[PDB]
């Protein structure tokens, strides 16, 4: 067919983007709420104080997912809602909420896929240096250990970190994400190393406290795309996809920087040569701690870029055609990224593969008929899933697909100016309206993708 019988169809959210209740029920502050307090940082000075008020309306959101036949729901845990100080005293109302949300998903036949860290680092830990502090490995370990002890018996999928490229790169190297800083290469690489150690420490303890929970991680990157399907152009894209970038570029946006240590046991050789004078102290236990065996690998994939080389072996990036298909972010629409991306990742790491995020922003409106018509989203998803199907038919071990946001939410620096959900959300009334893509997606799950349109 188009997909295997076990293909997991799902949707994805994150805590800070949907939950709201930022200063309620004992929830501590995080780095993004603090980031939003700086005037002019967020579009129109939006923040996540209320967001979609999912903390109060989660029962309606589960029922909306049941109305679409959604069988899996990827979401994240507000670390500051369970540990308002990052470490130490637990916030029982926070633990109670996630029990109630998880139980609500289980009761509605929805498989929870849990992200432990989706960027909302507790502010108390941030003011102790965050990932710069070597104690961050212990902080995240104890945080993971509690969640496994408290929910491991009813959570079968846990991924540690969401897009460390954004937390480390945009957050500490490029000054684009919270906390919004541009630090030394030493600081960024020590931070990178402490995050990878925190991942490994979390995986290790989660195997003792949650021995029946499958463990993974969901990084992100742009997908290098070959200009043709002959052997030489594919190799160029592959080499670029897993390359280590120079220190004068946005070098944290590397697949191998995080996944080679995690899966292969060490940083790439280029890492040690290029970053030599800024390297953190690396022990083989560090590498043995980071390289804990995983059960699956995940990836958030939104778009790709054509890459080739010139006579000097330097990367060449061809222009995009005038008027190319794009989204409300101005991002390009490149469905082949959901083939080459998964293919390259499976060939290098040979792990069961999930797409934990894929979607687009559309300038959606409630039209005069009280409906939300988003045919551009349907076409986007249809084209991307066709190339995803191509990877599964060629034998790559792809296990599922999570369409990014179930509902419109806080799109970080863009605030609420960008809508990624299949459910429209009026952020004043909090009225949820399922978009056309949501009803289309319901049929995609019902028919496991044999319904998808073709002639790509």
């Amino acid at each position: 067919m188009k997909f295997n019988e076990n293909f997991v169809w799902g949707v994805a959210t994150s805590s800070y983007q949907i939950e709201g209740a930022y200063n309620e029920d004992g929830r501590g502050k995080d780095i993004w709420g603090d980031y939003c307090s700086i005037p002019g940082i967020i579009f129109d000075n939006h923040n996540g104080d209320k967001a979609c008020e999912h903390y109060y309306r989660y029962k309606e959101d589960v029922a909306i997912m049941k109305e679409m036949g959604i069988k899996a729901y990827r979401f994240s845990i507000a670390w500051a809602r369970i540990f308002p100080e990052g470490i130490g005293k637990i916030n029982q109302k926070g633990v109670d909420f996630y029990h109630n949300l998880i139980d609500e998903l289980i009761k509605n036949d929805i498989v929870p896929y849990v992200t432990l860290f989706h960027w909302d680092l507790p502010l108390e830990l941030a003011e102790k240096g965050g990932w710069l502090n070597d104690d961050s490995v212990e902080w995240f370990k104890d945080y993971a250990e509690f969640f496994g002890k408290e929910y491991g018996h009813k959570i079968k999928y846990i991924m540690t970190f969401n897009e460390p490229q954004c937390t480390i790169g945009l957050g500490l190297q490029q000054g684009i994400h919270a906390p919004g800083v541009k630090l030394s290469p030493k600081a960024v690489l020590k931070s990178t190393h402490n995050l990878l150690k925190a991942h490994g420490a979390a995986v290790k303890v989660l195997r003792k406290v949650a021995p029946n929970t499958q463990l993974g991680i969901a990084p992100t990157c742009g997908v290098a795309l070959p200009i043709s399907e002959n052997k030489k152009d594919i190799e160029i894209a592959r080499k670029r996809y897993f390359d280590i970038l120079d220190l004068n570029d946005a070098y944290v946006w590397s697949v191998s920087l995080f996944l080679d240590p995690i899966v292969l046991g060490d940083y790439p050789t280029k890492y040690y040569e290029l970053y030599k004078e800024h390297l953190p102290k690396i022990t083989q236990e560090d590498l043995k701690l980071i390289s804990q065996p995983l059960d699956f690998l995940a990836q958030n994939i939104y778009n790709g870029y054509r890459v080739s080389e010139d006579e000097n072996g330097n990367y060449v990036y061809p222009k995009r055609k005038a008027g190319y298909d794009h989204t409300d972010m101005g991002w390009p629409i490149t469905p082949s990224a959901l083939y080459w991306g998964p293919r390259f990742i499976c060939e290098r790491y040979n792990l069961p593969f999930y797409i934990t995020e894929n979607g687009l922003a559309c300038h959606d409106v409630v039209s005069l008929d009280n409906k939300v018509h988003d045919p551009n989203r349907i076409d986007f998803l249809n084209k991307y899933l066709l190339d995803y199907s191509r990877a599964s038919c060629e034998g790559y071990d792809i296990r599922g697909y999570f369409q990014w946001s179930l509902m419109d939410n806080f799109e970080w620096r863009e605030g609420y100016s960008k809508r990624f959900g299949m459910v429209y959300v009026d952020f004043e009334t909090q009225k949820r309206t399922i978009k056309d893509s949501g009803y289309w997606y319901k049929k995609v799950i019902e028919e496991n993708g044999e319904n998808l349109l073709e002639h790509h």
Side-chain angles (χ1 to χ4, degrees), residues 2-4 6-70 72-275 277-310 312-320 322-442 444-449 451-456:
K2 278 308 204 333
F3 290 105
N4 289 336
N6 57 4
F7 195 84
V8 177
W9 296 95
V11 304
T13 60
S14 76
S15 54
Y16 187 81
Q17 294 177 269
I18 66 163
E19 277 186 17
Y22 181 75
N23 195 9
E24 265 146 56
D25 284 359
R27 189 204 193 278
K29 294 183 164 62
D30 61 63
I31 65 176
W32 274 94
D34 178 75
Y35 193 46
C36 294
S37 65
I38 310 168
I41 283 297
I42 311 295
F43 178 89
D44 278 359
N45 291 315
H46 296 164
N47 59 47
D49 287 354
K50 292 157 205 291
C52 315
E53 289 181 350
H54 173 81
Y55 178 84
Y56 297 107
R57 321 186 171 244
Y58 69 93
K59 277 183 157 102
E60 174 190 5
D61 292 329
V62 173
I64 288 172
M65 269 183 288
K66 185 204 243 227
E67 211 208 320
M68 294 185 268
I70 290 165
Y73 173 57
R74 165 172 190 256
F75 64 101
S76 95
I77 310 297
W79 186 353
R81 202 186 284 287
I82 298 189
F83 296 93
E85 276 151 296
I87 50 155
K89 199 176 224 67
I90 300 140
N91 181 51
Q92 191 54 53
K93 293 186 220 191
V95 173
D96 291 353
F97 164 72
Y98 288 117
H99 275 302
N100 294 333
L101 170 74
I102 287 161
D103 295 348
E104 198 76 8
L105 299 160
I106 297 295
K107 266 143 210 168
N108 290 267
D109 298 329
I110 298 165
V111 187
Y113 287 66
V114 174
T115 302
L116 286 185
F117 184 79
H118 205 125
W119 305 356
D120 46 349
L121 182 69
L123 188 62
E124 295 288 343
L125 300 187
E127 298 161 340
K128 294 190 190 149
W131 304 110
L132 292 176
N133 194 322
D134 287 331
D135 291 350
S136 52
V137 187
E138 183 188 318
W139 303 342
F140 192 73
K141 183 229 171 228
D142 295 346
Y143 166 54
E145 167 163 15
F146 171 80
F147 187 89
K149 263 169 191 177
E150 190 73 15
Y151 314 90
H153 58 280
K154 46 178 186 190
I155 297 293
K156 286 160 197 42
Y157 294 96
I158 287 175
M159 57 207 77
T160 55
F161 290 89
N162 173 85
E163 307 191 348
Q165 285 76 8
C166 295
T167 291
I168 308 305
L170 302 179
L172 306 174
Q173 209 277 318
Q174 300 156 255
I176 282 157
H177 275 188
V181 303
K182 306 161 118 168
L183 301 178
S184 71
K186 168 182 195 304
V188 173
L189 296 178
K190 194 194 182 198
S191 154
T192 298
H193 196 61
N194 280 339
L195 188 143
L196 292 173
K197 289 177 69 172
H199 161 84
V203 173
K204 202 157 83 178
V205 70
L206 278 170
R207 295 258 188 247
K208 303 173 185 178
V209 309
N212 309 80
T213 298
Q214 293 171 269
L215 302 180
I217 186 169
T220 193
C221 247
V223 179
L225 306 176
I227 65 171
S228 84
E229 282 187 52
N230 73 31
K231 276 290 186 165
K232 170 134 159 294
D233 299 337
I234 296 182
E235 172 61 21
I236 299 300
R238 184 213 66 81
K239 181 175 78 192
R240 174 59 185 89
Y241 194 39
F242 303 111
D243 207 351
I244 286 294
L245 306 181
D246 298 289
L247 284 171
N248 67 332
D249 292 326
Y251 53 92
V252 190
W253 281 93
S254 159
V255 177
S256 49
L257 176 62
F258 297 94
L259 282 182
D260 275 17
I262 283 174
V263 185
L264 305 178
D266 198 4
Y267 295 100
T269 307
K270 205 165 170 179
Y271 167 97
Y272 290 100
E273 310 171 328
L274 276 174
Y275 306 159
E277 293 325 310
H278 314 91
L279 289 191
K281 180 261 277 167
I282 299 160
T283 68
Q284 296 285 311
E285 177 55 34
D286 289 350
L287 300 172
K288 164 173 156 282
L289 174 70
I290 296 157
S291 75
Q292 291 304 132
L294 296 177
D295 300 297
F296 63 93
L297 253 196
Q299 194 79 1
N300 303 346
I301 289 172
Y302 291 88
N303 50 68
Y305 55 92
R306 301 294 180 197
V307 54
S308 193
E309 265 176 7
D310 54 27
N312 306 127
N314 300 131
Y315 290 130
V316 165
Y317 302 98
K319 55 139 173 290
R320 303 184 176 283
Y324 60 89
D325 298 355
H326 65 265
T327 78
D328 201 38
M329 311 283 291
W331 296 354
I333 295 183
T334 63
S336 91
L338 224 61
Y339 165 71
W340 292 113
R343 163 165 171 182
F344 283 148
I345 292 185
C346 292
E347 292 183 359
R348 188 179 187 88
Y349 304 126
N350 291 290
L351 278 177
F353 183 82
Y354 278 96
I355 286 298
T356 37
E357 279 185 25
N358 174 254
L360 85 168
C362 298
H363 42 53
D364 290 322
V365 301
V366 185
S367 43
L368 289 160
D369 54 12
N370 285 100
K371 302 183 187 174
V372 182
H373 305 297
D374 57 337
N376 292 160
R377 179 169 283 102
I378 288 167
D379 193 55
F380 181 97
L381 301 176
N382 200 154
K383 288 188 191 162
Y384 270 69
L385 289 170
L386 283 182
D387 275 307
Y388 204 29
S389 175
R390 182 206 160 150
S392 171
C393 290
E394 292 184 0
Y396 297 104
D397 192 11
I398 81 157
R399 309 283 192 98
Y401 168 92
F402 291 83
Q403 195 267 354
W404 170 244
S405 218
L406 154 80
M407 63 183 111
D408 309 326
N409 57 62
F410 180 78
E411 187 45 42
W412 306 114
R413 301 280 313 258
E414 312 291 331
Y416 305 99
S417 64
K418 312 294 187 193
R419 295 181 173 276
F420 272 87
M422 312 194 282
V423 178
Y424 184 95
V425 178
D426 185 300
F427 298 107
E428 177 166 309
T429 68
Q430 295 292 335
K431 189 213 183 59
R432 307 272 191 275
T433 308
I434 300 177
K435 313 175 170 178
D436 289 354
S437 58
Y439 297 126
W440 171 88
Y441 200 58
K442 172 176 167 201
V444 175
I445 309 177
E446 283 170 338
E447 286 299 291
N448 203 38
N451 66 329
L452 300 165
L453 274 173
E454 282 80 359
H455 285 345
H456 217 133

